[PDB]
Design a protein around this ligand. Structure first.
Ligand SMILES: [Ca+2]
Ligand SMILES: [Ca+2]
Lengths: 284, 286
């Protein structure tokens, strides 16, 4: 139930297998994000190339045709931005974790992680002396718990056979022979059965110190990882961050200007000269 | 090829049908943009849900578990903003163009549009006066070229008949008059050809005046469409713009602070107390 109970250091021992687990999960978490960002960028440039072409082949010409293209252009600037969001998540963040994992966890041959294995052995050693004494102590209490269960059997047995009618010449003595024999046990077994509980307590302050020394080490190894995680997530939020960006705002004040540059009357002047009454005519 | 040659005004008339198409094209262009916005927003939320589950059912607990989770949140917050872009494009800009195209163009029962048909007729009535005249000159150029063609024929024929001897005496008077009428036609048809040439130049000034009045009418209609596109495009640029949004900065406002709220020392202190030496023990007794 508790850490100090034999073999319960395991909960923290498992805590490092998970460390390697979570590194991979964090890596995939980000990996899927990058993938999502890339798709939005693929869809962006396709829509842009699709419609840049459709507008150019279409009937729209002149200055309004331009404002419209500025539109596809923004789909392309926005595409390049999310393309870099992805590039950053994979080239910087993802890799940073992949490399930390390789430096913090070393897959063994048999085999698990050289690190989890070392925590196991360190705990096992700390407990070893204490578990053996418990091994002795548990024999102490259980043997006597059968020794006391063995005084009561004859005390309530004798008065029971005392009321009995027959055979009291020598059969009397044996009745008084096997209740007092159990008397030497309850004193002899208990005497040592509670002596082991002594030795255990002498060899207890060390066991507690040899288990906090292994533990604080496991803690130190987790602390490094936790700090890493917080540090990396900080850099990730910065790579996803598009709320306050220079290049981003340029995309949109450029767009606005380009559309504002659209001159309806200018475009009309052009159509009059090149397809209308402005055209030259060879009069008979 | 020039606009002034008959039936060439059709280029500007064709412009009216094209205006209607372009309204449809812009409509479709924006729709596919809005659908892209939706797909991205959607992916972002499929993702957020998937990983909120995985981190919660996973081994990671404490403040770091949270910093990691405020992360699925930012994906959900970004997602919503792009659904806003999608919404604005379809509810405002798409509907806007859709309605304008319904009050600018009316579909005749027979075909085409009321405005396309209206302009074409306007160009015919403006041209008919001059069209009938060019038709007359068009013949004069031919009949005269036929008279000059037939003329050099008769002369060549008497000249080709200059060396060739009899027969005959009566055959000549025939080949003698053939030429006279020919030298007559070139002086006659030339007269009619000259007459129509000037007969047109007196009906030509009134031809351009009417052609212009119909043209400005088409410009008047094209101007509204062109000015409208400018208007709508500015409204889309505004809707597409996420580079300066309060609700957007706020996302990383809270992400950064939810991440910085992470604390290794605290998480470890919780673990030892709840899973380690901090735990009290049922120390053995008699
Ligand atoms: Ca074009
Ligand atoms: Ca969890």
């Amino acid at each position: 139930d508790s850490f100090w109970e034999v073999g319960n250091y395991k909960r923290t021992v498992k805590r490092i297998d998970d460390g390697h687990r979570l590194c991979s999960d964090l890596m995939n978490c980000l990996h899927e994000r990058a993938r999502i960002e890339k798709a939005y960028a693929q869809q962006l440039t396709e829509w842009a190339r699709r419609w840049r072409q459709l507008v150019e082949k279409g009937p729209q010409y002149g200055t309004v045709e331009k404002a419209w293209m500025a539109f596809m252009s923004e789909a392309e600037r926005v595409s390049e931005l999310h393309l870099e969001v992805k590039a950053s998540l994979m080239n910087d963040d993802f890799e940073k974790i992949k490399n930390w994992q390789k430096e913090a966890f070393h897959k063994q041959m048999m085999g698990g992680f050289k690190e989890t294995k070392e925590a196991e052995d360190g705990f096992r050693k700390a407990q070893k002396p204490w578990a053996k004494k418990l091994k002795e102590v548990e024999a102490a209490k259980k043997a006597h718990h059968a020794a006391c269960k063995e005084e009561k059997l004859a005390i309530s047995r004798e008065a029971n056979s005392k009321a009995d009618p027959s055979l009291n010449p020598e059969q009397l003595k044996k009745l008084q022979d096997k209740i007092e024999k159990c008397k030497q046990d309850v004193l002899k077994t208990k005497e040592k059965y509670e002596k082991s509980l002594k030795e255990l307590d002498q060899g207890t302050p060390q066991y507690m110190e040899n288990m906090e020394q292994v533990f604080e080490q496991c803690q130190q190894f987790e602390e490094k990882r936790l700090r890493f995680f917080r540090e990396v997530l900080l850099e990730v939020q910065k790579h996803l961050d598009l709320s306050n960006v220079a290049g981003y705002k340029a995309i949109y004040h450029d767009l606005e200007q380009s559309i504002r540059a659209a001159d309806a009357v200018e475009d009309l002047r052009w159509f009059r000269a090149n397809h209308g009454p402005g055209m030259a005519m060879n009069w008979p």
